[model samples]
Target chain A: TKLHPLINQKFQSPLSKEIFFESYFSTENLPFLADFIVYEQVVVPGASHISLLLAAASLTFAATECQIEDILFPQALAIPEQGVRTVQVVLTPQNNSFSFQVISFDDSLSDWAVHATGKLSVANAEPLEEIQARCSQKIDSAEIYQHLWDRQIHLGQSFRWIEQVWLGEGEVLCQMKVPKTILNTTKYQLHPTLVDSCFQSIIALVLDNKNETFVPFSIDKFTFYNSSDNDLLWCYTCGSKDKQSGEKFKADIQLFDQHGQLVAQVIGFEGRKANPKILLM
Target chain B: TKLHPLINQKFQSPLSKEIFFESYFSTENLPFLADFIVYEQVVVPGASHISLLLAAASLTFAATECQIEDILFPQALAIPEQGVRTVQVVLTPQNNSFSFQVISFDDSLHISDWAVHATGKLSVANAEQSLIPLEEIQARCSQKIDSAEIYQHLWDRQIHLGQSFRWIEQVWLGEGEVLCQMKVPKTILNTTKYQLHPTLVDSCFQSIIALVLDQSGNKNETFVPFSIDKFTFYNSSDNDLLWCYTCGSKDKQSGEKFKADIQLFDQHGQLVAQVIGFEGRKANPKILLM
Candidate 1:
């Protein structure tokens, strides 16, 4: 006899052979969701959505060594003041990969809406070239949090893992840590908070105006090299904006352990200043 | 800050995008393994292997609603006198399903060679299956057996299980099946962490042993699961009180082989899980009795 703590229910189609895994997300089960704040509203971070998707892929395919591709965030899933969001991850087999969708039940509409969709496949590790930091302009984590707080984006203690940063022309190197309270490193393939902090570092280098806010829209690919200790992390991110259009912001990030071993890579991370009214509930 | 009780480590490759999840299997954490006696030797049950695969799939793919297909136990995973085994479940994406392997590291070899123990296909479970009424099962089994007598019989045969592993409370022998009223002893260490309690399930298997021993006039024999054709879980419930109904018959070719279909239910008669086409074989007594 076996017991599962994650999935509420799992089922397969007799004819279609598609698999569906259902789970619930609530402040009661996961108190951390309340801490992921955007514009003073507790919002689910895009990195957490990726964690959910990865968790679904891990269960559906028994895939431990896996990669994610073409993650499109169509809408931001916000938490209610009370009650739980029943999230479902549906997996359909494609040639060489399992294409999946992360959908949540909209109580108001009585329907499920897709929040994030991506392709998950078996992965092979590729050795990455180490990044070197050129800029000497150092920024403290306090300054970054103060800047976000000034812009009305308040990250809770779990999300605020950025310790220090060094900036270049369009590049940034972040010294990050998984909070002491977050003890288990093996639970998540990529810890959501750790990944979100990597995403949060973009704000450190990109946002200059107190009113400007950058929200993740899409990611081209996310590849992992090794499991992180979830302790001390060194995230090196570099990007170049469009010279003519000067509209879209994109970056490539590489995460490493304290020993400088590559942990993960985020490619083609695309984001833009989201309208505060539209982003906030 | 959150933590999981299971899953030791997880990773994904940069290029091929293959995801990998890892965990350790040892008697230290799961003390119940030492109680799964086959001819007095502590062996990991086939059902437990299914549990491991389900756990791996659950963690690897975040799949809670899952099914097992074509499970073949090529070798028995016997726990050593001491130490731990690093068990790995490797999942490869297939056309309609994901195939997985249960392999353990060979500490005796002095090299990093994995010993393959079991292989299976993990997919989705069927949702629309109906649960058999608890009253219906209760009515079918006319004869009742006591848990104390069964424990006495096992003790006489030198098969001893700890108090935590003794979940069989009552037994009923029916026409072609056996039913058991079971519960996880309240005093056992952490039962909440598991998706399905392994000790409770092992006791469900024990119910079959109680039946065979009673039928054969207390014949001194030990049986262990050899292979499982299919195991499906429909729903999950935290109720400690569970009921098990196991239907068995001799294999057509070999009287020595016993094949069974086991169904698990909660106290309210709701079907929680089932094991289809479980084949059991008599293990060598000398290895264990020594």
Candidate 2:
């Protein structure tokens, strides 16, 4: 009701009202959550950073919610370690696909902030299965959700996205689909939910030896040669070390189109390391 | 903390977890809201149309809360007497200006569900201006609040991903005026077709929020958006930034729960939008999140 920034009050913190989360991970492992804010307040103190971290986790799920098919990649939402009060990710439709931007007013900054161009869409994909042959390791949907802390809603299906996964040297191959619960409908050639799910996979492949999670923080470019189709999805992702912003992992994902030559590519997808220890299932 | 779609449940509806609202004319008045199952059950038994209508309201609020600055005008997301579940308003942001679109997946043969592209903004005025100047409200807003919370509470996390126009320079006028300055996001610069951009028209409520919430006297005491009798937009705005002012009348029932009014204007001083009698009452902040 009160449209003022959600964080401007005394008792109410950043995630004061965003308790609902439906993801592959259960709520217990996701301590950076708003549903459990009181405990988070005692354990943490401030809401911006922890809230921002959860926002990253939310993007991971939003990928599935948006149903952006194919590759499992980091959901692209770059919040400062010190989060924002509220955010809006606007996908301004482009020539064939669309370009997006995430904007929010930081009650702390007193100024609005803009994170990456939030660009990505379906338009192109011409992949070779070498990405498949090279893929060897398989991580269960539970393991990754265990890390992101996705909690499925009982209203529909269970919380799970990775139908199958095969890990390569620095890349990954994944199989996923939109759950009955989240699969409503959309007008776009490719609903973002479907595509972001394709992108959510990069998260699983980009973690370091320390097991620290490197979530997507910025993306230099994500182009779709054509609009993605809605159905079961396949995503092929490759992670390269970031040369400049020295943070976490830098990834390039190509939509593994079981539906032939789709070009959904992420040029410089950057990830940031997070420590939501309470989220370790 | 699940990330599933909020409109798929049974007659009970989604957002049962959202316990923030506490009013009759509020969300109930938002007649287009999806979280209230009774309305969905009565107006449309099927989830398809209900869900799509809710999606429209969700986008309306998302555009308001995001606060992105810049231009473009409405393309209308109309609502029949009842509403639907899936909706999309896209702005093809070009170089100097833009073009827009409004698309929805609706099966209902309802009169309320019309379509429109969204565009608008708000900007703070100068010093000596009686309203809460932008500079004075700095530190209070110097940090950040997670945007995800907005998706959860305002939009039921349904419209969580797409980019939309959002801009507001919030300030509590020292004269006790509730206010915010906003800039029109460029998604609608060249867009000038639809009679009303549902997103912009619906956003007139933001002014209502800033004024009433600020006037509520206590920071902890905030009201949920109840039902609104009527909200109309007489003129359109081409200016990037505008001043929004919200005022309320004494409650006829409880303490301060009667009705309120809101108006919009460009920096050039042209009336952009106006609405009246947005009814609301006290609310519980407990059911917000985990």
Candidate 3:
């Protein structure tokens, strides 16, 4: 009763067709699928006056190991040349988890100053969901680090430098899948103002006994990268020499997109710092 | 052996002379003599309010039953033609014991009258104590009467007459004698300004009201008295009027004393009323004129 097509048609296997349809429709329900959730953990050096950085690293380590997303830098950074420093690292969905050990090394003293390790996961489908889960989490070693760091800084102390390394050997070059729930089409911007304030306050405390009450300084160098796309948004290797010393400190700042693409780079001295020049790069 | 003068030696009866000397000089205790202390009570009619006059009489009667001292016609002749109404009989010593009763009368309706009485001892005594005893007693009763009268006049709807009386017989004048203390003798000249301010606001409420309202037509005839002596000082003339027609209408404002008095006589040409004038009698002379 069915009319045949004017053109001849080839016969296909019914079982193979069913397998293809099911492959497109079937949902994966693996309990271990949580391992695929990404986490971002930033190890901020010089967060506390003395031992706060170590504490922060320990907290971050515990959180990352437990697959916690959105690990905040526990303490603010203070550099003598620069007033204050802030660093933020974002983990994409494809990069579900990471583990890094923080260790401090002094070449001249041949001493291991402070050491800690941490892991982080940030694969929540939505920012609100991520914040909610963070609020509910009982294990808050990261929060402990922040509190300890704040107390030490308020007491006027300096942050000691420490080394950091990833625990895994494989290079994590993964595609970040943006969740539909997170509505931001542009890159999520991290505010560096809080860290800047913290750094300035701590630096003021350090230079308390100096001749000049307030010392003028500039950020010599800074860098940022997106792990998802391995994008280098900031890079500054060379700059003019200082007229007084005939030597110039390298100044750079980098920003990256969600795909790990280098989106922007700022490199200049304080006098040359301009929005147009920075954005032109 | 001594030759005495004739005047010194002339003794007829030695026994009689000894008896006389003993009576005069001997320190012998004698029985305390008791004398009847008589208090004379008088009623000075107030203003047109006959009820208040009757109430004053009743209260005076309840206080004492002494004889009322009637001013003789000659004495009454001294009062100006306008007559005397509100006269304060000042009691002396500033402290004397007295009692009084006030009887309210209404001749308009004879049966519609009542009486109230009060008893109190005067706390001060001055000269002319007899004439002022009733005043002190009346002043005390007047305080109570004024309180009730003000309340009745302002609040009570019924027109009630107030009368007062003092019992002349009940008053015991000079029952207690004040011992004479040391006397300081000094000459005093009358340099005080007798007429400082008449129309004192301190007069009785009815008198003040009558003065301000000028209910009586003979407003110019009303006057108070001013007098001064070495022992007694006439402060100022108090507000007293003979008839309702002679009440004060305007306040004495020009810093001048309106020295005046009043005399009253019945139809038979006999003076029956005498009242003091109102002149600089008050410390503060300002009065609200209506």
Candidate 4:
């Protein structure tokens, strides 16, 4: 029953995803953290400028692992690489987290010249609309890293402010904190790019679920809430799924600040999976 | 004199760009190309899919060669990857193109085995510009702060990238042209060839991004590489600091979209790589704002 013999015959297997985590998702490699980097290219830097090599290595290894695991119909966006910094390392997890020194390459340096701590947690993979829509996401460590380590690299000295992302049916639950650099100047509020990350999460969800090549069309509209001291944003995406058109599918994204305040909302946003057309078969 | 100890002091030598190129620009591994199947995820089907990599590699190599040559600072981007079919393997020039023959490690045959052929042209070594004087462009190139000043309005953090491996030195030649000097990450040097290595080419579109985006007055813009007209590889080698010459224009129909033409030069001022036409669209930033 094999159509093209060139491909690995076994298409789907849970063990494949398991081994992918086993090999790449180790204590040292942190495949889950690096997985976002490869799929999303968003860095979770902890003085490890060598992160991409790790990201690349993660993907490279994950690729082999996927084949053995047979993760298909497989889809991944090509992503990349590094650096040096000094500090404490702790890999602080239930679903996840950590604190660890990400020491640079100076064989003489004690265990780690760089230190970073992270945390992660997840609940049922299922999406409960009411709960997801009313979730408030925040980060404790991104704040610490900004104050302790990234004072220089990140302009506003705030990076990796998005603490967690949970990909699920018809939605991606995410939490983000406003960073110093996101203000464009305290000039107004969250920087445009910071605001844009909300949309990227949408793209990430599409890639995780549906098996179709997608390109975002336009974010037709966004309505923002008044400003405040409560910085973290509780973000979520909601839309029609079972019958999403390959040509045009639209959705809405909502962002709420820490005080449970409505921050911003994107309505009628859209994307198109490459319209499939197989000709001359 | 070099400003920082770690900075590539040899940064401007034509060879800086050349060797940046010489190192990453190799022939298919033609050895490593067969080495890693790990992360490159896609099979090199026999057709159209192989076109962008050749095109992207061209941009990554040429971006380094364009400086001192006084070419426009170039910008760049990736198109995507392939399909297999029985057709002509025409290595096109200047825009609109794909190609090659067959050979699997296992010695198999498919109806779609194709070949990718690329061709190009290079201007003189010593040149000038009435457009964006060499004086201003030179300074612009030196302004290599990780999160550029222009992007400040975009985000407070370095939120646009994820562990990106490419670093660059560049100058904006003028409105339409630019000259660039860029650095590739370590990922290329050890190319197990086991996969589509990032250093195999710096994300070329980034250079294109530099050339096109300015501290301008527009809606906070987001760009998606819509398509590529052509990508061609000149028989060139590598170096540490690569140079690029770039030119761009706003689309005729939509002001939001831009087209950039990039030419990567070699040590001898030869065209090492060229993306005849790269098209990117300014998608509504709201589409991505969470």
Assess each model's interface with DockQ, reporting 2 decimals per model. Answer: 0.03, 0.01, 0.00, 0.01
TM (B chain), model 1: 0.85
TM-score of 1: 0.50
Candidate no. 2 TM-score: 0.32
TM-score of each: 0.50, 0.32, 0.13, 0.28
Query: Per-residue lDDT tens digits of candidate 1, residues A1-281?
Result: 11123455553322223566666677776767777766556677778877766666566554455678998887778777776777767677889887878777744433456778888787766622234437557877787788777777777777777887887778888888777556655767677777788888776666555576677888998876667765777888888654665556788888887776778888889877766558654
- What is the DockQ score, from 0 to 1, of model 3? 0.00
| Native contacts present in each candidate (fraction) | 0.00, 0.00, 0.00, 0.00
Local accuracy by lDDT, each model:
0.69, 0.40, 0.21, 0.36
RMSD, each candidate, Å? 11.6, 22.4, 44.0, 27.0
Q: How accurate is candidate 2 locally (lDDT)?
A: 0.40
Candidate 2's residue-wise lDDT over A1-281, tens digit each? 21111111111101122222221121332222222222133121111221222233233222321212222222222233335334443333345333443344433423444433433333223345656678878878555555444322111132344677787787788887766544432323343344445555776764433434454455565454444455566778777666676566777777645766553565666666654343221
Question: Candidate 1: where are CA atoms >4 Å away?
Answer: A1-281, B1-6, B14-19, B37-42, B61-63, B106-111, B149-158, B214-220, B285-290
Query: Which docking band does candidate 1 fall into?
Result: incorrect
lDDT of 2 by residue, B1-290 (tens): 21113322211102222111111111233333332222113121111221223232333332311111222222223334343433433333344322323333343331234333233222211112223333444333333333333322333312221222244544444233455566544543432432333334434554444433224354433454454443333344555666666667558567757467665655655555444565655543322210
Which is the winner by TM-score between candidate 2 and candidate 3? 2
| Candidate 1 per-residue lDDT over residues B1-290, each given as its tens digit | 11123455543221122334445566775677767665556777666777676666666544466788888877767767676776656676787577877776743331235667778888876564456878888898868978787777666566667677788888888887888888778656566666666676677667767556644522555565677788887666688788999888767797667788988887877777888888787654434333
i-RMS for every candidate (Å) is 16.4, 17.6, 77.1, 20.1
lDDT of 4 by residue, B191-284 (tens): 3221223432334555556655553544456454455565454434455555666678778787777788766555445555566567667754
In model 2, the Cα lDDT at residue B235 comes to 42
